[PDB]
């Protein structure tokens, strides 16, 4: 979802790139560092906005 021209809860209310954006989007799996069996309150999305 993190790309120019995309839509969704993140592209719409959390992180938006300009449509003439240049640069690189690097992604990797972090399951062994961020995951907690009880969850992690610190991570959320805005999920609503004007």
């Amino acid at each position: 979802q993190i790309a120019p021209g995309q839509t969704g809860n993140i592209a719409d209310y959390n992180y938006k790139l300009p449509d003439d954006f240049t640069g690189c989007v690097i992604a990797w799996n972090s399951n062994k560092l961020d995951s907690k069996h009880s969850g992690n309150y610190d991570y959320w999305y805005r999920s609503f906005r004007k």
């Binding site: 120019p4 021209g5 449509d19 003439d20």
Partner: protein, 50 residues
Amino acid sequence: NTLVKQLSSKFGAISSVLNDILSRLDPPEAEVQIDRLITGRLQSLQTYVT
């Protein structure tokens, strides 16, 4: 009459009406459809002036 009538042509675009392109598509695709219309109009104006 020919120069005006050329405005109704699509020149490969979805629609000959510029406002329809802007209404229907987001900037990064609309720019391509507009560039196609611009190319067609540029050809028509150069032919007329020549």
